[PDB]
């Protein structure tokens, strides 16, 4: 409490940005100077009316190309030669003139819904120290994933090629999924995130083409972190038997080797893999020199469980009742998702009261329910 002033400071600058930008546009933008006005005269001469998108099949080096249009006639197009002749490559979308087709210009970016899936639409606001603890297994992802991108300085000093890739694994609820999202928030490098269960389709051959796309975007964007969330979901998941199945699983694995390093020699991609079944992965992927140091996760010990429970109780209202220190004691080498579920359920017990004090009693009732998912989803209960 009392961060109001920081909120108003921030706000004030937002008001100042809105102001200056609006007023600047209005008769001081770029309306009254001849290096815009006379340049656009002859820009519009060779531009439409219709600008008729093409697809760039192949270039010819004489200032021509063969386009195939979405409207189905081909054109052997010229190229005006102010848009930079060779700066356009197959798969680009081209602006053709309303009359005789010249490449008027070239569009960089054409939003497909297929790179929407990879690309983010939300910001992962929980970053470093909201996954707090495992501070010895975060020096193998912020001394080889985050840190080389932030400082190439340290890695110029040793010379050789910087770290490449990591594989995360361990027991569920060790924060594995969020760790990756938390280092990519801070660097602000191009965060692609792809789920493991979308690589497997009930259609064949277009599975590996999807995976091939993901790394081409990474290589196109110089600072690159690709989170492949879940690649244990490639050996336990299958649909039909004619387009999923074994053949699909083999193909996708192999595509990924070429992409990640293989023969491509592409831009620096850090790969982060969440898995906990580490024999669904090639014997050409879990050798290092593609994935360098390997990260094991164990369930956090008792003093690390104090740190995990301290993230959660800054959000919780507290009482003179509350005893945090006994909530850790009952737990023995347990996961950080149990601790996260206890406090969320403790707030569900508060809500039921219809009170806004969360007490020790609400946490302990929720602790017994959280250990009930481990003793009664086990129908033997006490080990027979």
């Amino acid at each position: 409490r009392c961060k109001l002033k920081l909120l108003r400071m921030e706000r004030i600058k937002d008001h100042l940005l809105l102001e200056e930008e609006f007023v600047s546009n209005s008769e001081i933008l770029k309306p009254f100077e001849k290096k815009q006005e006379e340049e656009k005269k002859q820009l519009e001469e060779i531009r439409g009316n219709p600008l008729s998108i093409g697809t760039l099949e192949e270039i010819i080096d004489d200032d021509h190309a063969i386009v195939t249009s979405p409207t189905m006639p081909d054109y052997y197009v010229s190229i005006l030669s102010f848009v930079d002749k060779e700066l356009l490559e197959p798969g680009c979308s081209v602006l053709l003139h309303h009359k005789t087709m010249s490449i008027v210009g070239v569009l960089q970016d054409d939003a497909d819904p297929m790179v929407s899936v990879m690309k983010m639409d939300k910001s992962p606001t929980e970053s470093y120290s909201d996954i707090g603890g495992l501070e010895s297994q975060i020096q193998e992802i912020k001394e080889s994933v985050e840190l080389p991108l932030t400082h190439p300085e340290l890695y110029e000093e040793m010379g050789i090629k910087p770290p490449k890739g990591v594989i995360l694994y361990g027991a569920p609820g060790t924060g594995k999924t969020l760790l990756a999202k938390a280092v990519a928030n801070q660097t602000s490098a191009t965060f692609l995130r792809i789920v493991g269960s979308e690589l497997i389709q009930k259609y064949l051959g277009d599975g590996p083409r999807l995976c091939r796309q993901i790394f081409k975007v990474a290589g196109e964007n110089a600072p690159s972190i690709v989170f492949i969330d879940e690649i244990d979901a490639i050996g336990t998941k299958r649909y039909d038997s004619n387009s999923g199945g074994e053949r699909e699983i083999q193909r996708t694995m192999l595509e990924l080797l070429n992409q990640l390093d293989g023969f491509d020699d592409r831009g620096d991609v850090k790969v982060i893999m969440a898995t906990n079944k580490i024999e669904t992965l090639d014997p050409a992927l879990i050798r290092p020199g593609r994935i360098d140091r390997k990260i094991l996760f164990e369930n956090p010990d008792l003093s690390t469980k104090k740190k995990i429970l301290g993230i959660h109780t800054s959000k919780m209202n507290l009482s003179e009742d509350v005893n945090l220190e006994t909530l850790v004691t009952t737990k023995d080498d347990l996961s950080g998702a149990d601790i996260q579920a206890m406090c969320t359920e403790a707030g569900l017990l508060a809500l039921r009261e219809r009170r806004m004090q969360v007490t020790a009693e609400d946490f302990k009732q929720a602790k017994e329910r959280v250990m009930k998912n481990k003793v009664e989803e086990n129908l033997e209960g006490l080990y027979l």
Binding site: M158, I160, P283, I286, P288, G289, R293
Partner: protein, 51 residues
């Protein structure tokens, strides 16, 4: 490719100490790390069996 990762993991032990150089010692630790992981997995000399 194991030996290609001796140097980089030796470059990480150099950086904790703050060096611009690597020595023999940090290659010992690096080698020990890669060897333990090989046991932890399969493909250590493997052809993927047969001839």
């Amino acid at each position: 490719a194991e030996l290609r990762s001796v140097c980089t993991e030796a470059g990480m032990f150099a950086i904790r100490a703050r060096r611009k150089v690597a020595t023999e010692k940090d290659f010992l630790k690096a080698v020990d790390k890669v060897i333990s992981g090989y046991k932890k997995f399969s493909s250590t000399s493997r052809y993927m069996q047969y001839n």
